[model samples]
Target: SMSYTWTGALITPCAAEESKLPINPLSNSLLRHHNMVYATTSRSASLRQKKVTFDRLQVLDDHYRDVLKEMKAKASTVKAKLLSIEEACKLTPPHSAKSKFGYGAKDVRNLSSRAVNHIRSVWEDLLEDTETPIDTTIMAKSEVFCVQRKPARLIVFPDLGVRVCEKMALYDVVSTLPQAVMGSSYGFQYSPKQRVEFLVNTWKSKKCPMGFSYDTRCFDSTVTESDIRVEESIYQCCDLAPEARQAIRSLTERLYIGGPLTNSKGQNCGYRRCRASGVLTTSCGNTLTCYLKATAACRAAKLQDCTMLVNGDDLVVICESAGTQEDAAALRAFTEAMTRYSAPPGDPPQPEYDLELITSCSSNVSVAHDASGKRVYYLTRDPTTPLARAAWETARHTPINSWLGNIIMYAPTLWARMILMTHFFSILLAQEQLGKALDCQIYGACYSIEPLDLPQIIERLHGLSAFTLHSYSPGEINRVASCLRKLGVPPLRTWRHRARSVRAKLLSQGGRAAICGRYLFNWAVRTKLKLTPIPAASQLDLSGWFVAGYSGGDIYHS
Candidate 1:
């Protein structure tokens, strides 16, 4: 079946969309070639639609059935809970669109009588009707990147009322089921440090390890009605109450399988037959489906000792090698099987001999040295996009501060330590907003984080080693160096000098700011101060920090 059927309506934006990077005081300091940086907008949606709208064919075999049985066996032990209206209301992001029925996120969070009444009505509707198609809004994601441009990513979501209803029905199911069914293969269960540790240990566990990261082209579009139904079957395997089962069934039929797309102006854009990107089921559904397909494909390809790490559409597998030539042939067979399963690759898979080269989740494992001159492994990625987005975020007052997230996720990386910390702290100190809390996402879950808590946050997530790590791998340094050169940003040495001043100003503040300066910018000084574990690190309750991936789920944390 077709992924989408269009009504020939323009995908209009709610406001003026900026294309190229905007110039501001900090823009030139971070990146010089403002012309090179750009943002994707609604006008590019047609090209993306053409690329994503295609017919899908899926053929399941014994291996797929076998994997499904195993997954179901694990899933059977799981029990999921339906959230109350108050609980679901609290999860809504403040910026989430207001309900057409009246009331907004603030009203919902405050548990206003008006908001709760409407949500209950929406839930009641879900119970009584299972055949009506839910309406969804489609918009283009405004993402930043350098010269290499891609079409804007499309986001399809239902209104706030329907979204809150989704949470009430399946919040616990999405949160708990994947971790239970997939075990360690569920990528969101691990932090960056733990993820790298798993990859390294898995790689070393093999006699002759080889790996590859699989890229599914527009993964959401590849999802079919049968796929969504299959996902529902997995959810049904859980120990669920009668009402929960009914709600899931109704949601599966009404919203999950397909929906009508309405633009910002409430015009009919088209109908979507693929997975909705903004729903409670997205991450869980994609993980289960991706795992099922790849597990079967691995069997079909006869890949040996295969271990997979799946986060939504991003997949990386490390397995025992079958020699160079045979490994190449096996990967070709894997690609063939995946393509047949309707999850075709954006780029054909190639066997990677080195673990560091097998990038997934836009990150890879890299080596660096700690204060004691002992080699340590950490997660890192190409700084190009991070730097580009940082430039944009610095110039504009956006809702989410991705730079903070990048700093936390990539804390031990050289570019993040030297450039990101220096640049952002300077800006914060100048604005006297260092104490202000900002929102950022970690593994797709939004977090309200304070800039002053860096010392504790970094220590807890990555450890004190994050502050003292040096002697980075040449491959890692070269990636950062090349990115800086391309962006026409100042080199690391310049940032090092600038960091001293930022460090001094922060130190003089004499609180969390001082800790940030002492710990985060220690490398800038010749005679580095002694770095110790932060006392507050142990007290930080980071329970939901990496419990699941909520990429397009519209989740928020207070």
Candidate 2:
């Protein structure tokens, strides 16, 4: 079956789009070489469309069957509930597109009778008709990059009514089933601290450990009808309400398997036979499929005692080494097996003995020292993309605050602590915008967070140690240093001076703003304040922060 079959119709945007970085004084203050920063737009969608549309051939074996059986066994112990229409409607983001029936996201959220009735009808229609192809809007995603220009990623989603019904049918299954079925191997189940700990502990437990991160070239496009049905079979293993069962089956056959694609301008663009990016089941399905394929590939390659960490399409494995040459050969075989299974590598896999070098989810485990001189492990990544996006957001009012997400996720690291916090806080204080709420993605789900919440947010996720960390790993330091040099960002000393100024102002304001200044900017001062646990940290409802990856899935945490 073809992954996509397109007409001559174009994928158009809802409004005028900007591909070049807008010049502004604030952005110029933080980053020079503005020409290097660019955003992807619909103009490049044609290139991406050509790359993603293809026919897939999957060759499975006994190893694959074994993994599937084991996964299904765990899956059978699960039970998923259907969310009420009102409950599902509340998950919709405020800016979600309007339904054809004439209700918007705000109307859906307030439980407007019109929206709920239509959503109910959509659910009823699902139970009655199971094979009609759902229509999805295909548009190019506007994601920023530094220097390198890749084609815009495509997002396909159904109308608001069907989207709400999708949540009603599969929200519980996505929230609970992945953690249960994959156990500790589910990467999205961990906070940044826990992820660093898991990787460190797994590597330590192994004798002569070798690790590598797998990159599947176009994971969504690689998915075939057989794979989608296989995922449906796993879902059916759960004890579900009869209505839930019918809805799930209907969704699988009608929406999930494949759908027709329409542009934002109401023109038919093409048809999709691959996974829809903006759906409730996307994160869960991708995680399961990736885990299953890797597990089978490990057995086929005869890799020793593999421990996998899977978050959506990102996968990393730690296994006992069988010597460098043998390990390299084993990875080739693993890649070969995975390629046969349809998740081919973007770049050929290579084994690494140093854990710090094994980058997964665009992050690597790195070391830094606490105030007591104890070596603490934390997750860090190259700051190229983070800095680039921050420069863009500094001047432009964007939907997602990539700076806040980077600060929360990479708090203990040198670049995030020294550069991200210092840079963004300075801007926030200057503009008196610390109290304003900003949206950021944590594990792919969007949350409206305030800049004033940094102290508590960091304390809960990374701990007080994040504020005092210094003397980072040389390799990590080198990466950040090189990234700064490449991006024309100033050295750490400059941020250090600016941070002290920002910290003093925040402290003078008192209350939570003072707490943020005192804790998050402690590293800026020569005489650091004694760090303590934040009382507010314990009160935060951070339940779904790291439970799953919802990157392309339309989810919002109120």
Candidate 3:
């Protein structure tokens, strides 16, 4: 098998040199002096890897024990069902990476006998070997940026065989138990709407409110073996079948504890002596552990009635302010407590007086307006990651169409619907893949997404206002302008121009392409184009795709 190496610059090229054109004066001036940040080099990554591999940081205490007990009790109450092999296979996306067992995701989805037998053997082995640990295949994943350009992150995963077994043994447990234990604090269980509603409610509850986002450096690498065992202990508290229990225990000791790292060239990178990244329990385990540690740390700091919202390693805390001086002291104490718990701050924690100033999960809330002239609160992030991905999309064959996810998740925003969707769909059209479906990940699962589904998805996620008039805040406009300048993405005007031509081309096609042209680009027209039903759209239940519960918190269910 040939493996491609990213022999390019650490930071992906944003745009061609000749294409630079100033859009927003403020952004243009600022970006002239500053480039984006990159977090890792080969040297730094190696050092961090070595440090994490050798360091011992045990975090289990009376608090961890108590929390695990409570989590166990909650898990015991969960009535989770095991998914059938066929149903589980169906959930595997058509584009999932090929298995070393000589079968691809397509084969698995098609229920090829070879793939089924292999998956069955893995599950049977997990049940049969209760005491033995399972070994995982670890690889260094490249070009993934979050907040900043970073070195390739490590991904340790069991082969497709064990992955199928994982779905059978722990998928339901991971999906349901975190919510049961942490309730609203479990972030992955909620939609953007639910998150904003939660934030707004918390903000309203505080008089002289103060908030801060806490980031832990290399969170997965900091998980000690004891922590892994403790998570397993929590899992054992559940009322699971005998085989399930055995599989969980085996997975914990074998793969979860730490695994062998193999690089792209089949050379030994190193052994991972921390929590592995690509596992069913990765999100659930991190959230559970982080919540427990932070809860204890918060109490230790004596901040008044702190409300926490955690999504894996990213954390946000909001509470009643006890004056600026007291709050500052409180933050220091909180940082100290968190450090004592083996979860040190990545960036020094700072208190913010305004809710809007604090950023979590790489997103911030901003005010915008719909076509009806009503104020709409929506989530927006600096387009750094999106732009980086766009650069990649322009140049290579990407596994996932990130632009579509952004368009769906941030549909209500001016930049996403107008800029992102327009640009990406144009590119897709050019590739002759506009009507084609590709796999995209959202809420920790993959869905087959097509350009034709954008309108329905956007409408359901952001409401019909997505196609209506839009006005954006100066702050948002400025940020988007800055991001475009920095990432070498074209200005909104460029997107608009390109979209007009694309729309004309689509409308000329007179079928599904014409339907997309009308629905997606309706905002660009003076008189709104009439939206006719695309009967094929009914095959996709867009409304139920995102399941919102209490206060808009939603989960994705395929």
Candidate 4:
């Protein structure tokens, strides 16, 4: 990425009377919100809170707070030890680490007695604001499952006080933060502290692409009531208990993806062996994660127990329990409720569905080629039925068209366009905004303009009045057209690049996003019109340097 610097040039078309001079429009605030949205996604390394300088303080506070939490936990343990010591006067097992405490509890009783005064003394020292750096060894060990310690000697924190660190992926953190925060340009920079968290794009590129369809040819029609039983067993085995199950379900959002996989036979076949293993073990040769994700969706949506998507239809029927001793009862209860409504009196339950939920990751899933030089069967989706075929077909469509359109209209806030782009949402807000009289003239890559880009593009176009730099592709045409239909913009068979003659201002990424590093270096030499570098990471990388390049040098990554 190159650092960018700009020199202003004032052009006077013609000198005329003061009354004839044209008025410039006001700057947009809507674009700010959009930038905040994508900023959250790019997970920029740094450019801190309130201002760049304040951001450092904010991060330090966050780090300090986390340390405090750890200290508090240990402090609690010390108090417990004191209590146990008082009980030591009575009958007691040993009070050493090898005691029962070694297993899960520490001999806090006697230790608590001795440490009580010690803790109080330390507490007073801490209150004086002379706190020492917490060891955090116990805390880290307790949460070792959730967080891995950084082994490096140096770590850089970005301007933004983002929670991202070198140990976590930008996407992971981006996936968690609110869309508004992520859309901010500051959120898109590279933070040395967070640099360890992201994944290597090249490494990810070699992974298998998730196949959405199933290949039923691998299985025989000998499936039985037992088949479905094993399916339910494997599905629910990794699930949480009732209360915890509800908690996990609450975390599930619509379109949520990624999770562990369990085959139809109630086993882990790894990613590669998942397909063939499921068929042989449980008679269903399908992607395990796909099935689990679907199950999670069904549970979160609060659909009936028997709800399962097969092809394009939703099947509502209970199958026998496939679990063992302890889980059998709960499994039976679930199946009973499911089959109760689906089955006729004294007859087997019927399987009928409203709609099928097909998960195809081919477009996004990264697969490796085999010795035969072919990408095949790592996780193939069966296409024996019409429903499966249709789901596969639909998923093959570009995200720019199907998912993008749905997200812009229904999930408008998810798009998180900048302040100016937020105004573009008005274009989709109603059918009457098409060809509306405008104060500014528009020009540029004509074919690139449209609705799928939504609030983002709209904000960009409005931000820069001089030119419309479209980085859109041919596949994106339908998305724009679809939004236009809903918004009531005029329809067109094919939109060619056409410069609309009107007054306009040029808008692009400014400040740190433009003047820093590669963008500054590149634009200083290549200086192209319309293209601007917005501060944002181009990709999620654990080694840092993740910047998303858009609209010429619109570098949103830090």
The numbered model that scores best in TM-score is: 1
Clashing pairs in 1: none
The alpha-carbon deviation from the true structure for residue 470 of candidate 4, after best TM-score superposition, in angstroms, is: 6.1
TM-score of 2: 0.98
TM-score of each predicted structure versus truth: 0.99, 0.98, 0.84, 0.20
Question: Residue 525 in candidate 2 has what lDDT?
Answer: 86
Worst 10 residues of 1 by lDDT: 549-558
Q: What is the C-alpha lDDT of each candidate?
A: 0.91, 0.90, 0.68, 0.21
The prediction achieving the highest lDDT against the true structure is 1
**lDDT tens readout by residue for model 1, 109-189:** 899999898988888998899899999999998999998678998999887888898888788899999999999899999
Order of models, best lDDT first: 1, 2, 3, 4
Each prediction's number of clashing residue pairs? 0, 0, 2, 122
lDDT of 3 by residue, 1-558 (tens): 001122222222222322212233323322222234222333334433443443544444565566567667876777666767786677566666577788988888899998999999888877776555455545445443434334445556667777777777776677677777777777766567667778888888987899999998778876777777877877776678777888888888777877665544445545666777777778778887788778877777889988998877779999899999999999998888777777887899999987778899888877777666997777788877665554444444566667677777877777776677676667678778888877655755666677777776665555566566377788888988877766655667767776788888889987778877887887666777866454554555654243212110111235
Model 2 lDDT tens row, 1-558:
788999989989899998888888889878887889999999999999999988898999999999999999999999889898878888888877789789999999999999989999999999999889888899999989998579999999889999898888888898889988999999998999999999999999997899999999999999888888999999999999999999999999998999999998889899988899888899999999999999999999999989999999999999999988899999999999999999999988889999988999999888889999999999998899999999999878897889989998998988887888888888888888888888988887888989899889888999889989999988888888898888888888888888889899989999888998889888888887778888999999998888877776778885
Ten-residue region with minimum lDDT total, candidate 2:
549-558
Residue 407 of model 1, lDDT score? 95
Clashing pairs in 3: 190-554, 191-554
lDDT of 4 at 160: 11
- Which of 3 and 4 is ahead in TM-score? 3
Local error of candidate 2 at residue 452 (angstroms):
1.1
Estimate candidate 3's alpha-carbon lDDT, on a 0 to 1 scale.
0.68
